[PDB]
Amino acid sequence: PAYTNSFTRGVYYPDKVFRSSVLHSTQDLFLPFFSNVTWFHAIDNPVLPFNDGVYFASTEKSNIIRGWIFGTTLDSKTQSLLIVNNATNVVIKVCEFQFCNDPFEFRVYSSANNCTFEYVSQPFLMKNLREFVFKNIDGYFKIYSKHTPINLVRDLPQGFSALEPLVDLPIGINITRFQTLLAAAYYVGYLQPRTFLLKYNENGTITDAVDCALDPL
Amino acid sequence: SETKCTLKSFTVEKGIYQTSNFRVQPTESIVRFPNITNLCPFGEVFNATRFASVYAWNRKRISNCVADYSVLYNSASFSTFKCYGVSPTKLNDLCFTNVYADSFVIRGDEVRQIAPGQTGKIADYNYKLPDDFTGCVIAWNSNNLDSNYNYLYRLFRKSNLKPFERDISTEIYQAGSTPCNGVEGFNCYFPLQSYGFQPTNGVGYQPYRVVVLSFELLHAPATVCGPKKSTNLVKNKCVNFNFNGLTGTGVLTESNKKFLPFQQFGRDIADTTDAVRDPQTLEILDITPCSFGGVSVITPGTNTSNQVAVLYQDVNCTEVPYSTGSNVFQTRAGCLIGAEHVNNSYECDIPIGAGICASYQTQSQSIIAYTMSLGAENSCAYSNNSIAIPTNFTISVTTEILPVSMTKTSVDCT
Amino acid sequence: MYICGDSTECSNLLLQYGSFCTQLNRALTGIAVEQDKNTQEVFAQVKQIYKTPPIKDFGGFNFSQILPDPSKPSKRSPIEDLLFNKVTLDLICAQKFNGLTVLPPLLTDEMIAQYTSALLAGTICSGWTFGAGPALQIPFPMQMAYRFNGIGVTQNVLYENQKLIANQFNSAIGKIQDSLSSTPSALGKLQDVVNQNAQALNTLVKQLSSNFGAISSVLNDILSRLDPPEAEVQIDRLITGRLQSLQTYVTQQLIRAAEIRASANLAATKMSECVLGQSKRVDFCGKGYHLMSFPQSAPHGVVFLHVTYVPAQEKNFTTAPAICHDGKAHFPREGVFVSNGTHWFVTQRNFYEPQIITTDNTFVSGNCDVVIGIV
Amino acid sequence: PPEAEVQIDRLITGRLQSLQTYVTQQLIRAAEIRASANLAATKMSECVL
Amino acid sequence: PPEAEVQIDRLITGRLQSLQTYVTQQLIRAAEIRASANLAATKMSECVL
Amino acid sequence: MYICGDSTECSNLLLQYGSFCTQLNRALTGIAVEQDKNTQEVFAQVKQI
Amino acid sequence: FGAGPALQIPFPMQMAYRFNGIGVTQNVLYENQKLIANQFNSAIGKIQD
Ligand SMILES: *[C@@H]1O[C@H](CO)[C@@H](O[C@@H]2O[C@H](CO)[C@@H](O)[C@H](O)[C@H]2NC(C)=O)[C@H](O)[C@H]1NC(C)=O
Ligand SMILES: *[C@@H]1O[C@H](CO)[C@@H](O[C@@H]2O[C@H](CO)[C@@H](O)[C@H](O)[C@H]2NC(C)=O)[C@H](O)[C@H]1NC(C)=O
Ligand SMILES: *[C@@H]1O[C@H](CO)[C@@H](O[C@@H]2O[C@H](CO)[C@@H](O)[C@H](O)[C@H]2NC(C)=O)[C@H](O)[C@H]1NC(C)=O
Ligand SMILES: *[C@@H]1O[C@H](CO)[C@@H](O[C@@H]2O[C@H](CO)[C@@H](O)[C@H](O)[C@H]2NC(C)=O)[C@H](O)[C@H]1NC(C)=O
Ligand SMILES: *[C@@H]1O[C@H](CO)[C@@H](O[C@@H]2O[C@H](CO)[C@@H](O)[C@H](O)[C@H]2NC(C)=O)[C@H](O)[C@H]1NC(C)=O
Ligand SMILES: *[C@@H]1O[C@H](CO)[C@@H](O)[C@H](O)[C@H]1NC(C)=O
Ligand SMILES: *[C@@H]1O[C@H](CO)[C@@H](O)[C@H](O)[C@H]1NC(C)=O
Ligand SMILES: *[C@@H]1O[C@H](CO)[C@@H](O)[C@H](O)[C@H]1NC(C)=O
Ligand SMILES: *[C@@H]1O[C@H](CO)[C@@H](O)[C@H](O)[C@H]1NC(C)=O
Ligand SMILES: *[C@@H]1O[C@H](CO)[C@@H](O)[C@H](O)[C@H]1NC(C)=O
Ligand SMILES: *[C@@H]1O[C@H](CO)[C@@H](O)[C@H](O)[C@H]1NC(C)=O
Known part of the structure; x- marks a missing residue:
């Protein structure tokens, strides 16, 4: 429904290493440019x-987007x-939950069971x-976040976004399906293993990058 | 004598010879490690009443704490304490992260754990361990202590075991073409076969309590690691720093960069360790290595005199540790020790660096260093309506030597 | 140090591989010595320093764009300043930390400029006479008249056209300076050498962070992780990888140094022939008939300003092999017979200076019945 | 025989590397000497004759 | 795989050595041919023209 | 394609040895460009046909 | 044409110029033009054989 182009947003820091004025190529899953x-x-x-992987921009102001569902089977067995x-509070749990139906309060199995993490x-x-990734x-959930001051562009805000990592909580599940925990819209951008060239600035921030899969140039 | 040994000869001709390399040596040692001192939960998966089954083991996530592997290692117990990628004696010094203790029980005969890539099918359907396994494997005898947690095992799963994956529910199995609609015996047999050896005395087959630790080495926040000590933090000194397990030698100095709050290790162009984060008090320290260069011996011929003048190639003036002749003098090609600077200029005798030359001057018989002279001044009086015509000649015969052919050598192979 | 810095175990393991390190050090030292020798043959031709004359009475020739300028602290001519500015290269600090060092050249750029100005203040004053023996002073217009006779053109062409030739000289030098300042690709040969050297040095450093089949690229990680029986194997793998990388770098440096030595030999020959003389070899010193050259210092190189005589403004004539006056064939002594349609003259071959055909401009040989096309 | 083969292979690799290095050095030196000899022949033909 | 890595590593080392030797010999031969081409260009310039 | 011809398992080990392939490719490319430059220098003296 | 612009000249006159260059006068070529042309043609024909 009204497919918007990805442009050049969705670039993060592959690892917690400070590099300045350098052009390093990483073989890491990035969102392809102009997808x-x-x-x-x-x-x-x-x-x-x-x-x-999911690119979750979902510009909003009413905070109707509360959280995110991430389950493997969403009924039982897996966490x-x-x-x-x-x-x-941004409280996170991995307890076995059926999740019931669309939320608006705990719309879950309400049984807890494997309440480990x-x-x-x-x-x-x-x-x-929101700018979430x-x-x-290898049994590690990584979330990358950044806030962009955009209040004038309806579509994706042409530019670049150095997504500073937010948290690196070690968990593990296949997560075959997922659904946003809910007047706005949310985009989803799938992740592919594309080699990227990253130009770290003199202050250690990724100012620009090129997808080494798009075109022969 | 060092120059004499370098040329493998007792006679040294006039010139400058490169002998050995200089290197500033460390004075102190830094073993800065994180604040954590509370002991790790060892014995929770070691001194436990019961363990899990091989089909469904337990993956305990050891977290921030001091892990004294020495107590486990030196204990007069266990068996087949084989550590892959690490050495048990050095297990204490290393500072790991993400050690995942796995506890479960297998049969007495195997005790293999799929160690490198072992093809044994006992654990090929139960528990596969990855090839690049930087951890340890420990096996314990359980005959005396309730030979009841042997439980069961996966007889077959018609599928290979992906490394470090756990499969629990295996009820439907078949070998014939007939679909397994609740039929086990006719098709083949149902999986998750049981093992009864709770008492008995069968030697070589008593259940073994096997526990494996899977450390995650290399770059990481290093939450859980060993019981080392902590030394103070000295700046602008050649030290043997050991930051969070990162061993090396260099001069730690207060930084100026804008290290991001999530970043830990600092690099630069060509990927060398330019910066580091202090585990106790988070602060960034640039690590430039201690200075070094090439020691050169500016010497006249030993036939003339037995005096030399050392030139340290790169050390400025103060990184200096013959060796000292009360004539220290800074050049553009490093510190020159043993020669006196002479303001007068002569033709170059022994080249040194960027314009500096050295020679043995009698008028005391000491080595002097000067700035080379390009040539004799011949200010020529240019003037119009004035030409100079020679009135005599001089037939001069010069010489020129040119190598033509080198020696012809043929070297056999076998 | 490059194979393994501050590591006694790896250093001891390196001694088993013979004297590879000694061979590499000897080759690199020989390359450095040869590089020191390269600039001592191009520039150090004459060991006598001639100061630039203070007065400027060279007969209209400017010369201010190639002689040193006593205004800036560096005694470099404006063209030398442009050449030095155009060629431009911390990257060196990071490389230096891995056992690499850059030995400074024996001759600083100031002494290279002094040597160049010595060759430039001798060519102006004496000409080619200071490259053979002692310097013999001669006025510059007469030196250029000597050089005009070197290409078959008589002395009258210069003296009667002295102002025009001086103006063309000054305009050509100004155009040369403007072309050097404007086009950024002029100094390509000197920039390629620096780029190749920097690229090779960068590739050498980047090979240190390679596993080469070992557990880790860092030697310290391997050393303080395993017992010596296995650390020996891992360090041996790393040693083999680093040794192969160093050998490849050294061989490439040797080949590049041989190429640079050939270029430096050509440059020294060009200096000796074009600068300290007037070469008759075609297309050696510039395109056209060579007159004289001026050397200029450049970063890791030399720039020659080849002054040449190029004819233009052709005129079409009718020529005869000889002229039969009366039963005798008169051939031109020096020159060629040329008629504009009714009257016959004898002119030079490189210029149009018609003259009456007398017995002084011609010499007789035989009768006028063997030459084909006689008039 | 197995460990002897392994060590003999190590020695073979080392000696082969040494021979290759010697051959490459000889090739470069021979190129230098060939350039010098070409210069000498040109000098002879253009100055003696 | 874990046992085939050794064999393919031996093959990789051998092929790398072969390629390196070929490249070095090609570089030396190219230098010689460049010298010949420079001589040919000089001969053309100073004799044909 | 020469060392590990159409094999991902071998091509993954080829990455362990660094950038040797890049160096060989660059050397051969430089040799080819030098051959083209030699051919241009020898014959293309006067640009008037 | 290799030292500026091309100036036409009859080939016998150019041969006379080259004879002057080698030292011999103009008379030797113009009075022996047929012999020199025949020798030149014979030499070129013998080169092919
Ligand atoms: C619990 O585990 C600990 C691991 O150390 C064992 O404690 C050791 O016991 C031996 C004798 O069995 C003593 O010599 C050591 O000094 C003890 N070490 C410590 C740190 O206390 C203990 O045996 C285990 N309990 C069992 C196996 O029942
Ligand atoms: C040689 O040429 C230079 C450069 O054109 C002349 O220097 C100029 O002199 C005029 C007159 O004084 C000044 O207005 C210009 O600014 C100068 N140009 C530069 C670039 O400095 C110089 O005068 C000429 N020499 C002689 C003897 O006339
Ligand atoms: C030869 O060419 C020069 C220029 O290369 C001519 O000199 C020019 O003459 C014109 C007309 O008088 C002047 O406007 C220019 O300023 C002159 N140029 C220079 C550089 O001085 C010269 O006239 C030509 N000679 C002949 C005989 O045709
Ligand atoms: C070109 O040829 C013409 C004749 O076609 C020559 O011009 C004559 O020269 C004579 C001798 O000085 C004069 O008396 C005549 O008045 C000239 N005639 C004309 C029409 O000008 C001329 O000398 C030749 N010039 C050159 C440069 O070769
Ligand atoms: C130059 O003049 C002589 C006579 O002075 C010409 O010689 C004559 O040539 C014609 C035609 O071939 C003969 O018929 C006469 O017998 C010749 N006379 C003598 C005395 O030998 C000669 O041809 C003239 N040259 C040219 C080029 O016209
Ligand atoms: C992959 O997801 C599927 C789909 O629910 C699930 O059955 C399976 O257990 C998951 N596998 C792993 C290894 O997480
Ligand atoms: C980098 O940080 C410095 C801090 O002094 C700041 O002045 C500079 O503007 C920053 N550069 C960019 C491109 O943001
Ligand atoms: C570690 O302890 C020191 C000494 O009291 C203290 O200054 C520092 O803040 C502590 N670090 C952390 C991360 O708590
Ligand atoms: C080198 O030492 C001199 C004094 O000998 C001092 O002035 C200079 O600052 C020093 N330079 C460095 C880079 O340490
Ligand atoms: C004669 O030479 C002139 C030089 O300007 C040229 O233009 C003309 O075409 C030539 N004539 C012939 C017939 O070749
Ligand atoms: C030039 O060629 C013409 C035409 O073939 C011929 O008649 C004549 O003899 C030749 N020589 C001269 C000098 O005109």
């Missing part, structure tokens, strides 16, 4: 097939990752460009 991201609308929220994010973080999570690598 297509579905313009899913949520004023509703079907099961988005999480394959290998379900839930990242409910209130005004301040219960990290809460707490400080904060949030001109309100999710991926599972």
Whole structure:
């Protein structure tokens, strides 16, 4: 539905190493430049097939987007990752939950069971460009976040976004399907293993990059 | 004498010879390690009442704490304590992260754990361990202590075991073409076969309590690691720093960069360790290596005199540790020790560096260093309506030597 | 140090491989010595320093764009300043930390400029006479008249056209300076050498962070992780990799140094022939008939300003092999017979200076019945 | 025989590397000497004759 | 795989050595041919023209 | 293609040895460019046909 | 044409110029033009054989 182009947003820091005025090439999963991201609308929220990574821009101001569902089967057996994010607390749990149906309060199995991982973080999570990236690598969930001051561009804000990593909580699940925990819209951008060239600035921030898969130039 | 040994001869001709390399040596040693001192949960998966089954083991996530592997290693117990990628004696000094203790029980005969890539099918359907395994394997005898947690094992799963993957529910299995709609015996047999050896006395087959530790080495925040000590932090000194397990030698100095809050290790062009983060008090320190260069011996011929003048190639003036002749003098090609600077200029005798030359001057018989003279001044009086015509000649015969053919050598192979 | 810095175990393991390190050090030292020798043959031709004359009475020739300028602290001519500015190269600090060092050249750029100005203040004053024996002073217009006779053109062409030739000289030198300043690809040969050297040095350093089949690229990580029986194997693998990389770098440096030595020999020959003389070899010193050259210092190189005489403004004539006056064939002594349609003259071959055909401009040989095309 | 083969292979690799290095050095030196000899022949033909 | 890595590593080392030797010999031969081409260009310039 | 011809398992080990392939490719490319320059220098003296 | 612009000249006159260059006068070529041309043609024909 009204497929918007990805442009050149979705670049993060592959590892926690400070490099300055250098051109390093990494073989890491990045969102390909000038791709297509579905313009899913949520004023509703079907099961988005999480394959290998999700680009979650979802500009909004009403904070209707509370959290994110991330489950393998979403019924039983496997553990379900839930990242409910209130005004301040961003409490996360991996307890086995059926998740019931679309939320608006715990719309889950309400049975707990395998309530093992219960990290809460707490400080904060949030001109309100969410700019989230999710991926599972060798039993490690990594979330990359950044806020962009955009209040005039309806489509994707042409430019660059050096996504500083947010947290590196070690968990593990296949997460075949996922759905946003809900007047705005949320895009999804699938992740592929594309070699990238990254130009770290003199201050250590990735000012620009080129996708080494797009065109022969 | 060093120059004499370098040329493998007792006679040294006039010139400058490169002998040995200079290197500033460390004075102190820094073993800065994180603040954590509370002991790790060892014995929770070691001194436990029961362990898990091979089909469904337990993956305990050891977290931030001091892990004293020496207590486990030197204990007069266990067996087949084989550590892959690490040495048990050096297990304490290394500062790891993400050590995942796996506890479970197998049969007495195997005790293999798929160690390098072992093809044994006992654990080929139960528990596969990756080839690049930087951890340790420990096996314990359980005959005396309730030979009941042997439980069961996966007889077959018609599928290979992906490394470090756990399969729990295996009910449907078949070998014939008939679909397994709740039929086990006719098609073949149902999986998850049991093992009964809770008492008995069968030697060589008593259940073994096998626990493996899988450290994750290399660059990491290094949450859980060993019981080392902590030395103070000295700046602008050649030290043997050991930051969070990163061993090396260099001069740690207060930084100026803008290290991002999530970044730990600093690099630069060509990927060398330009910066580091201090584990106790988070601060960035640039690590430039201690200075070094090439020691050169400016010497006249030993037939003339037995005096020399050392030239350290790159050390400025103060990194200096013959060796000292009360004539230290800074050039553009490093510190020159043993020669006196003479303001007068002569033709170059022994080239040194960027314009500096050295020679043996009698008027005391000491080595002097000067700036080379290009040639004799011949200010020529140019003037119009004035030409100079020679009135005599001089037939001069010069010489010129040119090598033509080198020696013809043929070298056999076998 | 490059194979393994501050590591006694790897250093002891390196001694088993013979004297490879000694061979590499000897080759690199020989290359450095040869590089020191290269600039002592191009520039150090004459060991006598001639100061640039203070007064400027060279007959209209400017020369201010090639002689040293006593205004800036560096005694370099404006063209030399442009050449030095155009060729431009911390990267060196990071490389230096891996056992690499850059020995400074024996002759600084100031002494190279002094040597160049010595060759330039001798060519102006004496000409080619200071390259053979003692310097013999001669006025510059007469030196250029000597050089005009070197290409078959008589002395009258210069003296009667002294102002025009001086103006063309000054304009050509100004155009040369403007072309050097404007086009950024002029100094390509000197920049390619620096680029190749820097690229090779960068490739040498980047080979240190390679596993080469070992557990880790860092030797310290391997050393304080395993017992000596296995650390020996890992360090041996690393040693083999680093040794192969160093050998490849050294061989490439040797080949490049041989090429640079050939170029330096050609440059020294060009200096000796074009600068300290007037070469009759075609297309050696510039395109056209060579007159004289001026050397200029450049970063890791030399720039020659080849002054040449190029004819233009052709005129079409009718020529005869000889002229039969009366039963005798008169051939031109020096020159060629040329008629503009009705009257016959004898002119020079490189210029149009018609003259009456007398018995002084011609010499007799035989009768006028053997030459084909006689008139 | 197995460990002897392994060590003999190591020695073979070392000696082969040494021979290759000697051959390459000889080739470069021979190129230098050939350039010098070409210069000498040109000098002879253009100055003696 | 874990046992085939050794064999393919031996093959990689051998082929790398062969390619390096070929490249070095080609570089030396190219230098010689460049010298011959420079001589030919000089001969053309100073004799044909 | 020469060392590990159409094999991902071998091509993955070829990355362990650094950038040797890049150096060989660059050397051969430089040799070819030098051959082209030699051919241009010898014959293309006067640009008037 | 290799030292500026091309100036036409009859080939016998150019041969006379070259004879002057080698030292011999103009008379030797112009009075022996047929013999020199025949020798030149014979030499070129013998080169092919
Ligand atoms: C619990 O594990 C610890 C590991 O150290 C064992 O404690 C050791 O016991 C031996 C005798 O068996 C003593 O010599 C050591 O000094 C003890 N070490 C420590 C640190 O206390 C203990 O045996 C285990 N308990 C069992 C096997 O029942
Ligand atoms: C030689 O040429 C230079 C450069 O054109 C002349 O220097 C110029 O002199 C005029 C007159 O004084 C000044 O207005 C210009 O600014 C100068 N140009 C530069 C670039 O400095 C010089 O005068 C000429 N020499 C003689 C003897 O006339
Ligand atoms: C030869 O060419 C020169 C220029 O190369 C001619 O000199 C020019 O003459 C014109 C007309 O008088 C002047 O406007 C120019 O300024 C002169 N140029 C220079 C550089 O001085 C010269 O006239 C030509 N001679 C003949 C005989 O044709
Ligand atoms: C070109 O030829 C013409 C004749 O065609 C020559 O011009 C004559 O020269 C004579 C002798 O001085 C004069 O008396 C006549 O008045 C000239 N005639 C004309 C029409 O000008 C001329 O000398 C030749 N010039 C050159 C440069 O070869
Ligand atoms: C130059 O003049 C002589 C006579 O002075 C010409 O010779 C004559 O040529 C004609 C035609 O071939 C003969 O018929 C006469 O017998 C010749 N006379 C003598 C005295 O030998 C000669 O041809 C003239 N040259 C040219 C080029 O016209
Ligand atoms: C992959 O996801 C599927 C789909 O639910 C699940 O059955 C399976 O257990 C997952 N595998 C792993 C290794 O997580
Ligand atoms: C880098 O940080 C410095 C801190 O002094 C700042 O002045 C500069 O503007 C920054 N550069 C960029 C490109 O943001
Ligand atoms: C570690 O302890 C020191 C000494 O009290 C203290 O200054 C420092 O803040 C501590 N670090 C952390 C991360 O708590
Ligand atoms: C080198 O030492 C001199 C004094 O001998 C001093 O002035 C200079 O600053 C020093 N330079 C460096 C880079 O340490
Ligand atoms: C004669 O030479 C002139 C030089 O300007 C040229 O233009 C003309 O074409 C030539 N004539 C012939 C017939 O070749
Ligand atoms: C030039 O060629 C013509 C035409 O063939 C011929 O008649 C004549 O003899 C030749 N020589 C001269 C000097 O005209």
